[PDB]
Amino acid sequence: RVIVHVDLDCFYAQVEMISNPELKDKPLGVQQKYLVVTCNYEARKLGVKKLMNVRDAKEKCPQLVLVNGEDLTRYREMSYKVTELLEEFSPVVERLGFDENFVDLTEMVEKRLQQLQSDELSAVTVSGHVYNNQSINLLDVLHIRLLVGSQIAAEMREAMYNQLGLTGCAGVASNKLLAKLVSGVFKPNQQTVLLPESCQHLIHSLNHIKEIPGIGYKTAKCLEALGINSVRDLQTFSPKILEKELGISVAQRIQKLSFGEDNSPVILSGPPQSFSEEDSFKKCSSEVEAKNKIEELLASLLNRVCQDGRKPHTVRLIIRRYSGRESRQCPIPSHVIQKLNYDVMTPMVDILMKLFRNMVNVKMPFHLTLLSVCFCNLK
DNA sequence: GTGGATGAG
DNA sequence: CATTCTCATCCAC
Ligand SMILES: Nc1ncnc2c1ncn2[C@H]1CC[C@@H](COP(=O)(O)OP(=O)(O)O)O1
Ligand SMILES: [Ca+2]
Ligand SMILES: [Ca+2]
Ligand SMILES: [Ca+2]
Ligand SMILES: [Ca+2]
């Protein structure tokens, strides 16, 4: 396969610099509550880190311009514009978070090679960096295939910049793991292509186990408990003991990843399968409060159903108690689903408060720290 | 289907 | 560690 991973540069900060170009010459960070969730490259050179506490950021970089990024409407809107632009190149585009997309270019590459003539194959040319500086063998089929990929990735980024004013990086490789690992080698606004003989050099470069996809905090804790603390430890661990510890498909998967093998296909994401709205806070402790919060969250949600075309057939309420989340969910009554000029707030809040009182014993003190509404089962 | 664990940015 | 504010998959129930 030829796979591309496209990753937008400091995405939230970029959207803000487009929303307000008075900002693009200054160090800029996007704040959510007490965290600077991301910042532009001017800020990073001054020592601002992703997800940095506001106190640390004020002390380190008092010049930092901070814009509030708690409302994701604009980021979400730009995000979908990006994947839909990419869907002009191939029908199958896999989203990861708001600012990453994978595309399987192998169909398109194969078409381009068929169209190619004898004299200008000579004469195929790289777009962007070649990982680890290795030289292209224009006589190697796989090399040619990846170079054509790099040219497409270049056209993708050109379309993005022209149509949307957005800059990002791309990585081109034989699978999703590798494409995503290589896209960030040169940052920001650059692209790199991974040729197969230097794949092993790329996986060697990983310093920590949590740098493998799908190995989060909990999985790393499990592996730590089996004596596996590093990537080489994982490569080196008995497959059969690991299968009898994590399960067959998880063990085989995460072990393949550590040798750079990833056969997962690129899957079309499409529109969200669920919309939610949420807010975190120090204390909710009353039903009256937690009602007003829900009404607010629900109001935002209803604006988004309206946009979208499909109707939710279920609603989910989510809480976080002081000191993970809890949810209940239930079906939305058929008569409420036909809403779109009527009063849907009242029966919807009625349902959500029943869900709330099911989870929270209001006859006794409580103390929430997050509330989310969610619409799912979308038809 | 429902609700919790765990992954992604 | 999560934290933020989302969105997704897996699986016992
Ligand atoms: N739990 C999390 N882990 C990692 N990133 C997160 C998390 N929560 C929010 N984010 C945001 C913070 C940075 C952002 C992705 O990077 P961004 O696009 O801003 O910069 P880059 O140019 O480095 O790709 O994802
Ligand atoms: Ca990014
Ligand atoms: Ca990681
Ligand atoms: Ca989907
Ligand atoms: Ca995480």
Fold of A272-379: Dna Ligase; domain 1 (3.30.1490)
Mutation probe of ligand 1 site: the residue of A6, A8, A11 with most atoms within 8 A of C-beta: A11
Show which residues of A are catalytic. 100
For the CA of A212 and the C1' of B5, the distance in angstroms is 19
Task: Report whether the peptide linkage leading into residue A123 is cis, meaning its omega lies within 30 degrees of zero.
Answer: yes
Interval between CA A147 and ligand 5 midpoint (Å): 34
Identical fold between A10-71 and A195-271: no
Ligand nearest to the CA of A210: 3
Measure the CA angle with vertex A145, ends A140 and A147; round to 5°.
Answer: 95
Strand C contact nucleotides, protein CB < 7 Å: 1-9, 11
Nearest amino-acid residue to C7, taking CA and C1': A97
Distances (CA, A) of A277 to A216, A251, A296, A310, A369: 25, 35, 9, 17, 15
| CATH top-level class of A1-9+72-194 | alpha beta
Interval between CA A274 and ligand 4 midpoint (Å): 9
Q: Tokens 């003190």 — which residue?
A: A365
Q: Which atom of ligand 1 is nearest to the CA of A39?
A: 19
Nearest amino-acid residue to B7, taking CA and C1': A214
Interval between CA A101 and ligand 4 midpoint (Å): 13
Q: Which experimental approach was used here?
A: X-ray
For the CA of A328 and the C1' of B1, the distance in angstroms is 12
Residues whose beta carbons lie less than 5 angstroms from ion ligand 4: A 269-270
Q: Is A10 in the pocket of ligand 1 (CB under 6 A)?
A: yes
Ligand nearest to the CA of A215: 3
Residue A8 is assigned to a ligand binding site: yes
Question: What residue owns the CA closest to ligand 1's atom 11?
Answer: A37
Fold of A195-271: DNA polymerase; domain 1 (1.10.150)
Q: Is A30 in the pocket of ligand 1 (CB under 6 A)?
A: no
Give the nearest nucleotide to A37, CA to C1': C4
Interval between CA A267 and ligand 4 midpoint (Å): 9
HEC per residue, chain A: CCEEEEEECCHHHHHHHHHCHHHCCCCEEEEECCEEEEECHHHHHCCCCCCEEHHHHHHHCCCCEEEECCCCHHHHHHHHHHHHHHCCCCCCEEEECCCEEEEECHHHHHHHHHHCCCCCCCCCCCCCEEHHHCCCCCCCHHHHHHHHHHHHHHHHHHHHHHHHCCCEEEEEECCHHHHHHHHCCCCCCCEEECCHHHHHHHHHCCCCHHHCCCCCHHHHHHHHHCCCCCHHHHHCCCHHHHHHHHCHHHHHHHHHHHCCCCCCCCCCCCCCCCEEEEEEEEEECCHHHHHHHHHHHHHHHHHHHHHHCCCEEEEEEEEEECCCEEEEEEECCHHHHCCCCCCCHHHHHHHHHHHHHHHCCCCCCCCEEEEEEEEEEEC
Q: Which atom of ligand 1 is nearest to the CA of A41?
A: 22
Q: Tokens 């108690």 — which residue?
A: A321
For the CA of A316 and the C1' of B5, the distance in angstroms is 17
Nearest amino-acid residue to B3, taking CA and C1': A327
Ligand nearest to the CA of A212: 3
CATH of the domain spanning A10-71: 3.40.1170.60
Q: Is A196 in the pocket of ligand 1 (CB under 6 A)?
A: no
Q: CB-based contacts of A218: which residues, under 8 Å, 6+ apart?
A: none
- Beta strand A28-32 with A65-68 is parallel
Residue A7 is assigned to a ligand binding site: yes
What letter represents residue A222's amino acid?
C
Mutation probe of ligand 1 site: the residue of A8, A14, A31, A51 with most atoms within 8 A of C-beta: A51
Domain assignments of chain A as residue spans, ordered by start? 1-9+72-194, 10-71, 195-271, 272-379
Contact between A366 and A283 under an 8 Å Cβ cutoff? The reply is no
Largest CA distance in chain A: 82
Residue A9 is assigned to a ligand binding site: no
